[PDB]
């Protein structure tokens, strides 16, 4: 994303440090689904 196309004050939020966030974000979504599928099999007879 480019703030200030054409002007002396032109800067750009780069992708190299955003690609690292998407990496941690994937992980923290898999961990939070494994811990949901698991815990719903275990409590199948405990009427939730």
């Amino acid at each position: 994303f480019v703030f200030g196309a054409g002007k002396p004050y032109e800067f750009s939020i780069d992708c190299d440090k955003i690609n690292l966030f998407r990496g941690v974000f994937a992980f923290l979504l898999y961990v939070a689904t494994f811990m949901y599928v698991f815990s719903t099999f275990a409590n199948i007879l405990r009427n939730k």
Binding site: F1, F3, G4, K7, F25, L29, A32, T33, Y36
Partner: protein, 44 residues
């Protein structure tokens, strides 16, 4: 009035910058609302 000319230039410049800012805030607020939805769907 050598001052009127100057004051007018600085207002013009300011208006331009507020425009660029209203853009940046919609990109960032988008992202924040998008992280908050996905996390919710995932955790009771």
């Amino acid at each position: 009035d050598p001052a009127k000319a100057a004051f007018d230039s600085l207002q013009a410049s300011a208006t331009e910058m507020i425009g660029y800012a209203w853009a940046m805030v919609v990109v960032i607020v988008g992202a924040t609302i998008g992280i908050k939805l996905f996390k919710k769907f995932t955790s009771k």
